[PDB]
Amino acid sequence: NTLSYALMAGYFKMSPVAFTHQLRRQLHPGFALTVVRQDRFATENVLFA
């Protein structure tokens, strides 16, 4: 039974104009993303000469 739904879900197109539907409508496509970001922290160094 569930194989039917699995096969059916394996039939949503892969295209920007279709992603703008799938992704927004809470459906998980066959991808896995990897977020990356960069941060900065103001520290207090201790120099020596």
Place this chain on the structure above:
Amino acid sequence: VVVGDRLVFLEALEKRVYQATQVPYPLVGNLDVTFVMPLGVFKPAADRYARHAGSFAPTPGLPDPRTHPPRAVHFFNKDGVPCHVTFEHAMGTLCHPSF
């Protein structure tokens, strides 16, 4: 002061110089790291197991929303408030002719 086996000066120049002027003190450095977190990975079948018997048990008579592939990540802000990332925040990349 004396440190190890050496006698060294010890000076902080906030008062003599840089006081009452717009210039910033050049010893407040900026560290710079970068973070990464996986979004929607799905662990293989041999690693989907509840640690104890009493899981985060759901409402009785309703399906368990834990056994499904995840579609978000929840992390913490600078203050401490939570801030989630989900697939809808990727449209800016996966909706473009560059794809």
Place this chain on the structure above:
Amino acid sequence: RHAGSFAPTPGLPDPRTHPPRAVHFFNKDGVPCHVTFEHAMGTLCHPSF
């Protein structure tokens, strides 16, 4: 030893009762690095056998 096991996902056979076919240990830095049967082909697949 405890009744509460590593209880599997309900509706699926538990992968615990089968005879094991791999190990798992720690690297130098600490990353998990595992060994399984497939690594033995260099020994059990040779005319010296």
Place this chain on the structure above:
Amino acid sequence: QMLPQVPAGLARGQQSVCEFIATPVSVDLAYFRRACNPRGRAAGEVHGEE
């Protein structure tokens, strides 16, 4: 110009920006626990010549 319009009011420090790198679902998860490289190959320069 192509520049965004100035924001009305700032709460905390300048807001960061996130990317998104596609990756097969079956990728191992333990690859992300330690300090990793998002590219997938850990190449860099310090360890490994051309």
Place this chain on the structure above:
Amino acid sequence: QMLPQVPAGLARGQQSVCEFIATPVSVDLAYFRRACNPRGRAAGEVHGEE
């Protein structure tokens, strides 16, 4: 020569080498929890004459 090709950079110390020894399935597990001898026996020289 019959030699392997040099790898393009490596991340940690010289990678070691492991072998494999056939062994009946019913071998006692408790034999491996302490210091054991992979030969099965306890040949040595320090405990035992020839």
